[PDB]
Amino acid sequence: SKLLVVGITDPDPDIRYCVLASLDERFDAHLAQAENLQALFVALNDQVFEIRELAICTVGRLSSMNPAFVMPFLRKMLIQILTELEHSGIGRIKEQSARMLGHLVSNAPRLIRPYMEPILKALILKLKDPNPGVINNVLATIGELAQVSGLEMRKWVDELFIIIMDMLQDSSLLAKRQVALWTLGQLVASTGYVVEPYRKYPTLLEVLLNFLKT
Amino acid sequence: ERNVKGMFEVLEPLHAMMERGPQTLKETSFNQAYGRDLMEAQEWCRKYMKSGNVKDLTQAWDLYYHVFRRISK
Amino acid sequence: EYTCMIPRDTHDGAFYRAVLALHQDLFSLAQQCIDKARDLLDAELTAMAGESYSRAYGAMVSCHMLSELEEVIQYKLVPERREIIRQIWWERLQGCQRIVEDWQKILMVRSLVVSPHEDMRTWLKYASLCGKSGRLALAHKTLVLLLGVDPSRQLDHPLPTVHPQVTYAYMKNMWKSARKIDAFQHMQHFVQTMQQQAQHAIATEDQQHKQELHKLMA
Amino acid sequence: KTKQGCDILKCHNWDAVRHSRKHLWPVVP
Amino acid sequence: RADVELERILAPYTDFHYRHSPDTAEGQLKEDREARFLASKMGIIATFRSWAGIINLCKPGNSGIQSLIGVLCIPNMEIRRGLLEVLYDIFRLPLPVVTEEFIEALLSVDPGRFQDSWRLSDGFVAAEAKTILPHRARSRPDLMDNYLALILSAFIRNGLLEGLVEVITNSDDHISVRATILLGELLHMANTILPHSHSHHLHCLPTLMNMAASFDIPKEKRLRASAALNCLKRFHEMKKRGPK
Amino acid sequence: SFVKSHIRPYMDEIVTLMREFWVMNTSIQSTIILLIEQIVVALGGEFKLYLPQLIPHMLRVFMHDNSPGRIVSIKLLAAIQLFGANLDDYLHLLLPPIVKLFDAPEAPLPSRKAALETVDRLTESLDFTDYASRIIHPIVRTLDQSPELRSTAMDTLSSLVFQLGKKYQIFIPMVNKVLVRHRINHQRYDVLICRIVKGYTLADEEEDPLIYQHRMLR
Ligand SMILES: O=P(O)(O)O[C@H]1[C@H](OP(=O)(O)O)[C@@H](OP(=O)(O)O)[C@H](OP(=O)(O)O)[C@@H](OP(=O)(O)O)[C@H]1OP(=O)(O)O
């Protein structure tokens, strides 16, 4: 309780970041009480973005130990994250909201498995817009989302393949290719797209073999 | 016309389509309202058709007239 | 005691050490062994893929065999995906080249968690491939393994009527191999004891059993 | 009312509440 | 008989134009309708206290409880406002005041609200301490919780929460406030008297959160779903505050 | 101004007429802000349906402002004070530009005063309990490096800690250092922290502020 009070009320964010980072999974049975969750809910709405990331990771991890406390705040935070994605047209806020959504979907798999449809619609409509941070961010989020929900993303793997091959092959810019390759391999081990993209996209095997020599 | 074999074939398809189960909410509400009287009237008319006696048809027509007067309002 | 004398800086040594760690439920060391065997194979792969794809298929089949162990990890960890990968493995096997030498080792890496008696759709195709490739005795061994009893010892006792596709393939193999007369009587007996079975099967909801049996009787 | 009772009932497909009335929001074990 | 005798008593609610007597005075047609509503409500909340009514009304076929939830998902503001009183009186919950704002009806369902028994003449401090201070028993069975858990599980199995979400969105404000408070009370009762497997996936609310996060629907439904989720969070804060 | 709520079926196109001619730095914004104020007074509660489409441009006024004395920001904040309870689902992306406005030491002083005053006045219809740590730390950053913004920041702090009950008792030794360092005395803040530290009653501490606003409106 003294550590949570210090991590809430300290002026400089370094001690707050150290306190919010030092409360790892060894305190999972003791942070899931009433007052500790009430302190972490204060830690969610912080000024700086890294402590917001860390507190939403801790709370998304803790949300299955005591769901009756954490469910309404997480519903409100998920709606706030999607509203920051679509409505506000600033690239920095969209990048931070995609990163926060990826942290929530990496730390809480069971809760967002029924919320796959509008989140994936928002991320796909953000990928179809007319810094490379937002791109590798949303690739990491969509890879973790493909890993969480299997066989319900078969209605989305075609558009994801057409997008991620145009970002992989014929790279007009020097973007991150490793995260795209990991994301491409992550949605074929969950959906089961095994032999069909070899003939639906006849240049896939060639550009997969070219990466070994260049 | 005193045609019992005419009214029987008139209202037997209605009993036929009523015993295959209600499929909507309106049919379920109609069943919950009138289905007991429309079953007992069919039982009385079957008892009349087995052993011919107008004493069994009068009660069936009593139930039918009660259902008709409740529907017509 | 055989694996410890294999050199560890080669690809097959790291592969056998990975499956050795995977057998005794060590999910962290086996992952790093697989990941090191990846680049130990990738060296020879990029050395061989510069000529042609048909020259590099011999390393691609080994890379596909190596990347299928993580699905064995998911099989031994996640119980709800156990059917799903068991589908896509079959869906991945229909793209490989039909050669018994690589099919044997692919099935051997696949048989780390899947016994032949729970996935028989994959072993009947392997037996048919062994029969078409002239290696009929391995097809016979797989058919008697999938059946459960060897009918070549009891020549007068009938064939096991349960698992009908397996005894159908066994009667086809018996007609093809040596005996053209006894397989005829065996198929007649199979026909009568199987049309004797569908009469007592009054299926009202499960409709995926009558039509496949109709297919088999045709 | 005891842990052994709920464990017996779980084998016969009958669930039970595993918390007491002491706390309003009990952490799931 | 099977499905036509006992299920007659929920016929004023399931049939929108219900005529009980064939020959009645046409001058009294609204008071007769309110009398039918009151008597059918008393009969419905009297069959759910007996086991032979609970089992016979929640049969796995086309029962009389699914016809009660199915007519709740139909935008008829006379049956929909009368079924909520039955749902409030079945679960022994206090009724809020008839208003259009959530913050006024939330205050009327406060467990620490003033009552006439707490005056100095009747029941000065002891009757107030009975209400606001909790009981000393922390391991007694409390069979009322068993009955309410059975009724709540039987109602959730036939899809009551989806119907309550549909009443919350596609209706008037007078009914949306009452259905939001009813959903808040049921969600609070779920994490209190239900087992963990019954109540670990109820608080997610997929049909409401997928409506509050979909930007393809018209914006009124999305905004009223977001407002409903905010009111549910406010009700949860009010419940975790406690009586003062 | 003449049709109060009957402007709704042609409201949406009005919004896309405003999103096309709201260029960043011209003289056209001063009438767009007055049009926004008149639309807010006309609709009165239903404005939240048409609030998000006008949300990005406002943000682009808050950071990319090269007006003399930042008067367009002051007009936009005076237009924001009329929103009332409409920015309930949109306070998460409209409050960080305002709390970023009074802690910046290079901003003009009336703009920071307007930002502190709109944060002070927006708590009479909204719940600012969740966004406590995003406001407590800039205000104590506004108090130790600005000798002129002391009274307005203390009034904003008092209006914020009136909503928070015993949830502010952890912040008191953090603010007390800055208060005794510069000898800052505020009478309403002293009343509130006296009722917070030492008890007044049990029912008034930790109370929903919307409940209090509703019970005092009647
Ligand atoms: O080689 P055949 O003796 O003519 O038998 C074939 C063969 O199946 P088997 O070799 O496993 O018995 C076909 O499969 P392939 O080996 O040619 O790929 C199979 O077709 P499927 O691929 O659809 O299984 C076909 O069955 P069908 O007659 O439906 O085409 C079947 O023929 P029979 O079973 O009649 O001998």
Side-chain angles (χ1 to χ4, degrees), chain A residues 1-168 175 177-214, chain B, chain C residues 1-199 201 203 208-218, chain D, chain E residues 1-22 24-244, chain F:
Chain A
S1 291
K2 287 195 177 178
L3 256 61
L4 276 162
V5 158
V6 162
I8 284 304
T9 75
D10 223 41
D12 45 356
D14 290 327
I15 290 104
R16 291 193 284 166
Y17 192 83
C18 272
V19 162
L20 265 298
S22 70
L23 301 169
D24 48 354
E25 288 93 337
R26 305 169 286 115
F27 304 123
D28 203 2
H30 280 262
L31 283 184
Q33 307 284 336
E35 53 265 19
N36 308 341
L37 270 170
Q38 286 202 47
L40 289 179
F41 289 155
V42 178
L44 248 63
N45 270 285
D46 214 351
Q47 173 72 44
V48 284
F49 173 60
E50 291 93 29
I51 312 189
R52 278 195 270 149
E53 265 200 38
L54 198 53
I56 205 175
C57 273
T58 302
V59 153
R61 163 166 54 89
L62 257 71
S63 166
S64 196
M65 299 290 291
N66 201 347
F69 243 108
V70 195
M71 271 323 171
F73 217 94
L74 277 198
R75 285 183 313 220
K76 199 199 179 64
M77 276 295 287
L78 184 56
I79 290 172
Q80 282 184 350
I81 278 156
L82 296 172
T83 316
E84 280 184 354
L85 271 177
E86 173 151 350
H87 283 326
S88 90
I90 295 183
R92 160 171 286 195
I93 305 182
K94 290 197 292 188
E95 158 187 5
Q96 290 172 348
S97 162
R99 187 76 165 179
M100 209 91 86
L101 179 51
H103 281 314
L104 200 66
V105 85
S106 88
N107 272 270
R110 290 164 91 177
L111 328 182
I112 319 187
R113 200 195 266 99
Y115 315 136
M116 196 271 304
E117 177 80 20
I119 291 186
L120 211 63
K121 266 183 177 177
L123 294 171
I124 279 177
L125 265 293
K126 279 301 138 188
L127 265 194
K128 289 183 170 192
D129 46 346
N131 42 6
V134 55
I135 297 287
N136 74 290
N137 277 150
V138 69
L139 283 187
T141 71
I142 214 154
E144 291 275 359
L145 197 38
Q147 190 169 345
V148 160
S149 42
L151 253 291
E152 320 166 59
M153 214 161 293
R154 183 158 280 273
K155 54 187 71 65
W156 308 106
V157 286
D158 302 67
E159 295 84 1
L160 288 163
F161 254 78
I162 300 182
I163 285 170
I164 211 175
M165 261 181 47
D166 293 358
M167 306 197 317
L168 257 184
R177 272 180 159 175
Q178 182 189 194
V179 300
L181 209 52
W182 176 86
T183 303
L184 175 63
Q186 206 61 226
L187 67 97
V188 306
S190 289
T191 310
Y193 217 37
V194 274
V195 189
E196 292 145 79
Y198 267 149
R199 59 180 176 180
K200 286 257 297 183
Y201 316 100
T203 43
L204 175 58
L205 187 57
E206 319 167 19
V207 305
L208 275 178
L209 286 176
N210 290 332
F211 292 157
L212 312 181
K213 61 183 176 61
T214 72
Chain B
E1 285 83 1
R2 300 301 180 175
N3 190 15
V4 280
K5 256 50 190 174
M7 59 158 285
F8 262 50
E9 74 155 30
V10 156
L11 54 87
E12 266 309 317
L14 301 168
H15 290 302
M17 66 102 71
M18 208 178 175
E19 297 183 350
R20 61 195 49 174
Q23 301 172 352
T24 57
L25 279 170
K26 178 54 155 288
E27 294 172 9
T28 309
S29 88
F30 182 84
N31 194 74
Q32 287 168 355
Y34 310 93
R36 191 257 177 198
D37 304 359
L38 294 171
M39 272 185 170
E40 200 182 1
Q42 181 193 13
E43 181 83 24
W44 281 116
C45 82
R46 195 181 309 156
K47 283 184 182 180
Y48 160 72
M49 189 254 286
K50 173 206 305 179
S51 157
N53 187 20
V54 78
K55 201 182 58 177
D56 281 334
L57 202 66
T58 44
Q59 321 194 44
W61 263 117
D62 198 330
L63 295 166
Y64 277 146
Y65 196 66
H66 188 75
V67 170
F68 175 81
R69 269 193 298 158
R70 276 183 65 226
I71 285 178
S72 196
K73 288 288 192 306
Chain C
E1 72 101 18
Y2 282 148
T3 318
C4 48
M5 301 197 207
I6 314 183
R8 320 165 84 252
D9 221 318
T10 79
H11 167 73
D12 289 7
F15 178 81
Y16 279 119
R17 272 156 170 81
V19 65
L20 181 54
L22 211 152
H23 170 238
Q24 43 204 15
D25 302 328
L26 292 181
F27 302 147
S28 197
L29 172 83
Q31 180 65 35
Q32 192 63 18
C33 275
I34 285 168
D35 197 277
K36 216 213 300 183
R38 276 203 199 279
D39 49 289
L40 287 183
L41 159 136
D42 164 82
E44 197 265 0
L45 178 55
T46 192
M48 195 147 302
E51 314 174 34
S52 86
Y53 178 56
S54 44
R55 196 89 203 278
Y57 180 78
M60 183 147 311
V61 59
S62 194
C63 101
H64 153 268
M65 182 166 56
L66 183 64
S67 91
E68 274 205 355
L69 280 170
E70 304 169 327
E71 304 190 12
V72 182
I73 293 292
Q74 271 197 334
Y75 199 97
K76 289 213 300 181
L77 270 185
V78 172
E80 41 264 29
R81 296 223 64 199
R82 285 187 170 182
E83 186 40 65
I84 310 297
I85 59 192
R86 204 163 50 181
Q87 165 74 25
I88 74 182
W89 276 349
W90 159 262
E91 270 205 340
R92 200 175 304 150
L93 204 52
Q94 305 304 300
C96 282
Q97 202 177 20
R98 319 188 85 248
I99 298 173
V100 295
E101 210 289 326
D102 59 76
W103 268 49
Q104 187 159 357
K105 58 187 59 180
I106 283 180
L107 259 53
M108 205 168 60
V109 177
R110 184 166 307 189
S111 86
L112 203 52
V113 290
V114 196
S115 80
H117 274 255
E118 49 196 48
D119 213 18
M120 54 179 48
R121 185 186 48 183
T122 309
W123 281 85
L124 286 176
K125 305 300 294 178
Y126 175 69
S128 88
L129 173 69
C130 277
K132 289 172 174 52
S133 159
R135 198 179 314 191
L136 194 145
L138 185 55
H140 178 72
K141 290 163 49 189
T142 47
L143 283 178
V144 303
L145 201 142
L146 196 76
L147 265 189
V149 289
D150 204 317
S152 196
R153 296 175 282 97
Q154 32 186 17
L155 308 190
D156 51 14
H157 289 290
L159 265 67
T161 308
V162 78
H163 296 307
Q165 312 268 358
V166 193
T167 163
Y168 169 73
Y170 188 82
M171 280 178 300
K172 283 207 310 168
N173 166 81
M174 176 196 314
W175 154 269
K176 189 192 310 174
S177 46
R179 300 163 297 189
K180 293 186 172 181
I181 307 98
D182 203 305
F184 192 43
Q185 314 283 136
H186 272 328
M187 185 70 71
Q188 289 175 1
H189 278 271
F190 183 71
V191 164
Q192 48 92 13
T193 65
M194 188 138 299
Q195 62 187 11
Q196 189 188 150
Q197 183 190 92
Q199 311 172 7
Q208 68 286 310
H209 188 258
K210 313 172 300 178
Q211 262 305 110
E212 59 86 20
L213 268 185
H214 275 104
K215 281 283 168 208
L216 186 50
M217 302 175 286
Chain D
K1 267 178 56 62
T2 51
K3 179 186 184 301
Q4 185 187 356
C6 312
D7 277 358
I8 285 175
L9 255 59
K10 197 33 153 170
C11 315
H12 301 84
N13 265 353
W14 272 56
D15 228 335
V17 291
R18 305 275 203 151
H19 59 254
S20 164
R21 218 175 295 157
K22 194 173 306 303
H23 301 304
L24 192 43
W25 319 101
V27 44
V28 177
Chain E
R1 294 192 174 275
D3 296 341
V4 304
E5 288 225 39
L6 182 66
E7 273 80 11
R8 171 84 182 275
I9 67 182
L10 46 94
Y13 289 102
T14 323
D15 199 1
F16 289 164
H17 310 104
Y18 180 69
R19 176 69 51 150
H20 182 260
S21 200
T24 188
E26 208 262 357
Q28 31 264 27
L29 277 193
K30 215 173 310 302
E31 323 95 287
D32 181 39
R33 193 165 180 85
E34 307 305 325
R36 291 304 178 272
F37 275 179
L38 185 55
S40 161
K41 175 169 79 64
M42 287 177 181
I44 286 175
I45 73 181
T47 57
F48 274 104
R49 318 300 201 192
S50 279
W51 289 101
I54 293 166
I55 297 178
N56 282 268
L57 278 180
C58 314
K59 282 193 297 185
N62 52 306
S63 43
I65 190 181
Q66 278 195 338
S67 87
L68 217 52
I69 306 302
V71 300
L72 190 63
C73 312
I74 296 179
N76 188 9
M77 305 313 160
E78 182 205 10
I79 308 293
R80 186 174 276 190
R81 93 159 70 251
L83 273 172
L84 289 192
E85 301 197 28
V86 189
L87 292 177
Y88 260 95
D89 293 338
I90 274 177
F91 293 106
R92 288 297 197 84
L93 302 162
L95 268 77
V97 287
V98 198
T99 175
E100 283 190 352
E101 40 187 280
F102 182 84
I103 214 70
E104 188 178 2
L106 172 60
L107 187 58
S108 46
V109 297
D110 201 348
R113 70 191 170 282
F114 175 67
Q115 281 165 203
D116 54 4
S117 83
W118 298 358
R119 314 194 93 102
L120 201 153
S121 315
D122 198 315
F124 192 30
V125 174
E128 169 161 29
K130 284 251 298 187
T131 304
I132 68 108
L133 284 177
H135 202 96
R136 294 299 295 174
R138 298 164 188 89
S139 45
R140 221 90 172 275
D142 195 13
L143 267 60
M144 192 77 164
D145 285 18
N146 290 261
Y147 160 77
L148 285 185
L150 192 130
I151 287 296
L152 185 66
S153 305
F155 262 93
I156 285 179
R157 178 65 166 85
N158 301 275
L160 174 60
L161 303 188
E162 280 73 63
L164 279 184
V165 163
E166 193 91 330
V167 170
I168 279 171
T169 58
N170 198 314
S171 172
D172 265 358
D173 305 348
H174 268 100
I175 320 187
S176 291
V177 171
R178 194 177 288 263
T180 313
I181 296 192
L182 182 57
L183 183 57
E185 295 259 29
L186 291 194
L187 284 174
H188 182 241
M189 217 194 311
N191 56 64
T192 300
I193 72 180
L194 278 192
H196 172 278
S197 146
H198 285 64
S199 88
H200 77 282
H201 71 289
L202 294 178
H203 320 280
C204 313
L205 278 87
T207 171
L208 193 59
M209 276 279 295
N210 292 341
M211 196 183 314
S214 198
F215 296 90
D216 304 358
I217 68 176
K219 60 186 83 66
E220 307 96 13
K221 304 195 63 51
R222 205 207 74 82
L223 264 199
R224 69 186 46 165
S226 195
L229 286 162
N230 295 8
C231 295
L232 284 183
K233 183 196 175 188
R234 212 159 299 150
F235 190 87
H236 171 240
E237 297 193 80
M238 200 275 304
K239 271 300 183 176
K240 78 174 176 182
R241 258 190 71 256
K244 293 299 181 181
Chain F
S1 159
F2 298 146
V3 286
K4 312 298 165 52
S5 159
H6 313 269
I7 209 64
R8 198 219 180 277
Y10 336 99
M11 183 61 218
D12 212 339
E13 299 96 40
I14 284 178
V15 183
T16 187
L17 276 184
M18 271 185 290
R19 282 200 292 181
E20 288 187 5
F21 310 121
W22 199 351
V23 295
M24 268 299 104
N25 306 314
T26 59
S27 159
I28 211 183
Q29 300 176 321
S30 279
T31 168
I32 287 298
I33 291 179
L34 193 43
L35 173 57
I36 286 305
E37 294 195 47
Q38 284 169 332
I39 283 165
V40 162
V41 175
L43 275 191
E46 220 176 291
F47 184 59
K48 52 181 176 56
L49 291 166
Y50 310 105
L51 188 46
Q53 289 92 28
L54 309 156
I55 275 179
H57 291 89
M58 289 169 187
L59 305 190
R60 306 203 202 105
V61 173
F62 274 132
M63 47 177 186
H64 300 149
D65 195 11
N66 46 34
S67 171
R70 261 181 161 266
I71 198 65
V72 186
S73 296
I74 298 180
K75 294 198 64 172
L76 189 49
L77 286 179
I80 277 181
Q81 298 180 19
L82 301 186
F83 286 173
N86 280 117
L87 72 180
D88 204 340
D89 305 78
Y90 311 115
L91 199 64
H92 52 93
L93 42 65
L94 213 51
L95 180 69
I98 311 182
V99 310
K100 210 194 63 65
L101 193 53
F102 50 77
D103 53 2
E106 80 280 343
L109 203 80
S111 183
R112 307 173 65 181
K113 261 188 53 57
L116 282 178
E117 281 168 356
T118 183
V119 173
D120 165 54
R121 206 177 169 274
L122 220 53
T123 72
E124 304 170 5
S125 44
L126 285 179
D127 178 79
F128 272 69
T129 307
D130 302 7
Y131 322 97
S133 72
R134 208 195 284 261
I135 307 184
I136 291 295
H137 293 111
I139 283 185
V140 307
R141 265 192 302 160
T142 327
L143 278 173
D144 58 352
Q145 62 105 20
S146 305
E148 192 58 20
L149 300 189
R150 302 270 171 82
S151 159
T152 319
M154 281 311 295
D155 272 318
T156 300
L157 184 56
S158 317
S159 176
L160 176 65
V161 308
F162 178 73
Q163 300 187 337
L164 279 75
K166 309 202 82 67
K167 302 175 176 182
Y168 184 71
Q169 202 174 2
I170 50 180
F171 292 100
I172 297 184
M174 194 264 291
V175 191
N176 215 343
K177 313 295 185 52
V178 193
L179 291 186
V180 305
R181 189 191 311 167
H182 304 116
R183 220 174 324 287
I184 293 159
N185 47 345
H186 203 248
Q187 143 192 339
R188 182 189 179 194
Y189 183 83
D190 279 10
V191 168
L192 287 175
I193 68 172
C194 167
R195 286 197 293 194
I196 279 179
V197 173
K198 306 213 181 302
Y200 174 73
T201 188
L202 260 184
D204 281 278
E205 56 198 35
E206 186 205 19
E207 188 191 3
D208 210 17
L210 299 191
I211 294 296
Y212 173 83
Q213 293 167 359
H214 168 79
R215 210 194 310 116
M216 288 310 160
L217 190 134
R218 304 301 174 92

